[PDB]
Chains A and B, each alone.
Chain A
Amino acid sequence: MIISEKNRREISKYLFQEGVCYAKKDYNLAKHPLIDVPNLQVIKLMQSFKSKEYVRETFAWMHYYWYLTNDGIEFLRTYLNLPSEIVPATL
């Protein structure tokens, strides 16, 4: 899916800073409740991350639940150019 660079940066930043993220299955929602990006782009970016094992996806009662993995943490650290010391708030 075509995603603006700023939107992808914001999504990745939020995911790494928090380590978890949810999303209601609403493709046409204007903005994600926690992220300024539209809901569809957040859902599809998380699906892309899950497809290559960067995140774990759980679905229940029309909602998504994404949890970052070690490979996902490494990818986000490399891509965001953050120092190795900084880690997701969950740890």
Chain B
Amino acid sequence: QISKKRKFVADGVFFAELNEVLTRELAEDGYSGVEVRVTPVRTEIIIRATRTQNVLGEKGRRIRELTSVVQKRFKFKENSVELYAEKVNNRGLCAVAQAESLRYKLLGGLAVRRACYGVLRFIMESGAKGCEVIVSGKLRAQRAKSMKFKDGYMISSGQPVKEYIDSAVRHILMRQGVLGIKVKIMLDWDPKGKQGPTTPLPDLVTIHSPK
């Protein structure tokens, strides 16, 4: 019975809180993102991850636990909110997944340069028009420094950034401090819209071949 303004703001706040909770809980399991769909007397939450076996667990025990805790914490009516785990298509095109993969590689003792180059190569071989990986923090010395790896196309200004660029930021807790990892992936135009924006770049003009 609350006003529309407060209703929409609460919906956004719930989405943000659920995203943060899932990110904290499903860190190692991989968590690309979540989507909330509202239906009459039913709300659907879809978890996107690169490893849905871990998210579901054995016989869906983990997903059932997550559904129960979400329902109890968010005051949802019982048997009204259900969770689903879905594969992420082209995980190499998801900035969050690549950032988590780089975090896992770095936490495993892999050299920063090798891990970043591998991530760049995997992203490029996955159909990305371009990518950029930045590693910041105390590397090899007590003095912090930044490492930048880049290949392919990249835009940084104007409206098309919000659709043609997928970016993520993650922190890695190392022994001597925090490491900052930024992943920025430039998508490619997709007429279907499944793998990229369904809109061409503003300054791209195509002339049909004459008969």
Chain A contacts to B: CB under 8 angstroms = 18-22, 34, 58-61, 63, 65, 67, 89-91
Contacts and interface: CB of A to CB of B under 8 A. Distances in A.
A60 B61 contact: no
A22 B72 CA distance: 8
Contact of A67 (B21, B69, B73): B69
Contact of B24 (A18, A34, A59, A90): A59
Contacts of B24: 58-60
B25 interface: yes
Interface in B10-35: 17, 20-21, 24-25
B25 to A, nearest CB: 5
Interface of B: 17, 20-21, 24-25, 59, 61, 64-65, 68-69, 72-73
A90 B73 contact: no
B68 A90 contact: yes
B72 A21 contact: yes
B68 A60 contact: no
B68 A20 contact: yes
A58 B62 CA distance: 14
Given A67-B65, A90-B64, A91-B61, A20 B20 contact: no
B211 to A, nearest CB: 61
A31 to B, nearest CB: 15
Contacts of A59: 24
A52 to B, nearest CB: 20
A21 B69 CA distance: 6
Contacts of A61: 17, 20-21
Nearest to A18: B68
Given A19-B65, A20-B65, A90-B65, A60 B21 contact: yes
A80 to B, nearest CB: 19
A19 B68 contact: yes
Contacts of A89: 68
A69 B24 CA distance: 18
Given A63-B73, A65-B73, A91-B61, A58 B21 contact: yes
The 4 A-B pairs at the shortest CB distance, nearest first, are namely A20-B69, A22-B73, A60-B24, A60-B21
A91 B58 CA distance: 10
A34 B72 CA distance: 8
A21 B68 CA distance: 9
Nearest to B16: A61
A68 to B, nearest CB: 8
A80 B65 CA distance: 21
A82 B20 CA distance: 36
Contacts of A67: 65, 69
Nearest to B17: A61
Nearest to A19: B65
A34 B21 CA distance: 20
B179 to A, nearest CB: 22
